[PDB]
Amino acid sequence: PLVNIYNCSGVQVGD
Amino acid sequence: PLVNIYNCSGVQVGD
Amino acid sequence: PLVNIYNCSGVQVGD
Amino acid sequence: PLVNIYNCSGVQVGD
């Protein structure tokens, strides 16, 4: 509806 | 289509 | 030395 | 050990 994450292949936050 | 998590292959929080 | 989580102020995994 | 996150003020992944 507002904001999201769709079709996201590989997610690495920091390292 | 709502505020949740679907088709999420492997999840690592902190480590 | 060891993989952990310290001084973490509020955590929201997914939502 | 080497790769980490230190002194991180506000962390917003996606939204």
Add this chain to the structure above:
Amino acid sequence: TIYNSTGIQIGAYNYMEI
């Protein structure tokens, strides 16, 4: 490793008013 993490979040946090 996480050290001194002020407000951590991952995905999406919003609100509806309809």
Add this chain to the structure above:
Amino acid sequence: TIYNSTGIQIGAYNYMEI
């Protein structure tokens, strides 16, 4: 590898009114 990070975010954050 993050040091002295001030307001990290990725994707897009906004608000709606109408």
Add this chain to the structure above:
Amino acid sequence: TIYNSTGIQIGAYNYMEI
């Protein structure tokens, strides 16, 4: 919020040998 997410992680995951 999260749809079709392949390998999600947040922080730091590494290994040691010495």
Add this chain to the structure above:
Amino acid sequence: TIYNSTGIQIGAYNYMEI
């Protein structure tokens, strides 16, 4: 908002050999 994302990451990922 993230759509059709192909290999997202933030900060730094590398490996050591010495």
